[model samples]
Target: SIPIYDYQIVHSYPHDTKAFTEGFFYRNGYFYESTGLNGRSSIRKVDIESGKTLQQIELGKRYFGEGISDWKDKIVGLTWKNGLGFVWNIRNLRQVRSFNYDGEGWGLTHNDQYLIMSDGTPVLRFLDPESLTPVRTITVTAHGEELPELNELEWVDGEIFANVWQTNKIVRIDPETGKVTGIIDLNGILAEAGPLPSPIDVLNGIAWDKEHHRLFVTGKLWPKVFEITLTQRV
Candidate 1:
């Protein structure tokens, strides 16, 4: 059996209940997120503590924004089914350019070199940071079985942590071999805050605060973002 882990919530921070969070990451003391829904798709730079949208840019009604990843001064955003992606200036939050890709886009993260992307499939693609072109691909598997629906990724402490779409489970993946090393089951986390003020959606967003060594998780239309610590289950 694969290693399963439980979590303890260390802190809770306010999040927009209206934001259908799809892609999320933490950088420079703020949370950068991409929200879905065709007409409501957007990218926002949010304050970590208050969960306030410090900066935002809309993608309009044509595209359903999915995952986002930062490369240097640029933030790259993906659309769900349009096969279209956008690059924005991280500082000014202005659209710099748009690029074309194949297949459906889901989650995105990066290491020192390649921008790693998931396409609603088991295979993960590694692309060149500058060219935005594929250099290699790896199939994600757990116990010799391919696992699909990998969404909302974050590179944590040298490993890739990916949220499995529509589930409260997140998988720790080995970047080199694309093998699932551990699983994090966040059961009952939703009820920890008591009752909700609004309807919530599936578990989706993940942001790693590397400077503070914090792992934050939230769901679509969730009211709060949770910072959690994991304990290996027996």
Candidate 2:
């Protein structure tokens, strides 16, 4: 099967330009988010079509929020360089507890068994969902070489979809082998969103709607979120 992929837009929805999206995921009928930057960092629940923040809680000025994943009834979030992680009740967005972690936290996603995390490195760490302790780890490789700068993750159709920082490409990895299985090029996505504000940010954020088999992506300071379907590149 061909590994390279191109995208066709399914639809586009409004997105907040002020959000420097770090961690993003779709659950039920809502979009859950974790935004970056020291003072602007926050955890929010947003409306899919309207792009309105329905619920939110801001992080402290010292914490730069990173990725997030849903585990059971709790939403677990990470902070960059703070070595700390937080858990909140999914329904009310109430803080439940906070745990300590090692190294820099970048992106996070969860599969059936474990919470998968990226630290802006080639290594992907797996943590036990209950204990929040390291269970295993894997080194991601692309064409036999270590692939770094892994950011914003989504578990889609039994594959790990990750954003390679500062790039318009998303790589699909075989979680068991940690080898790149496919690559999706989103070359003109930004231009398609129309002219953007200054300091237009890099592509990031991935969310898969398992029930509908829909894929959604947005950039750090993007004004639009796109629903895309992957087409095999000719």
Maximum-lDDT candidate: 2
**For model 2, what is the C-alpha lDDT against the true structure?**
0.90
How many steric overlaps are in each model, in order? 0, 0
In model 1, state the lDDT of residue 9: 94
TM-score, every prediction: 0.96, 0.97
lDDT of each: 0.88, 0.90
Misplaced by over 4 Å in model 1 are none
1-234 per-residue lDDT for model 2 (tens digits): 528999998999988887899999999888998986435698999999999989998887877789998998999999988999999999888889999988888999999999999988999999998888888999999998999999999999889999999789999999998999999999888888976877678999999999998899998889899999998888
Candidate 1 C-alpha lDDT tens digits along 16-43: 8878888999888889999864357889
lDDT of 2 at 40: 67
Q: Quote the positional error of residue 232 for candidate 1 in Å.
A: 0.7
List candidate 2 stretches off by more than 4 Å. none
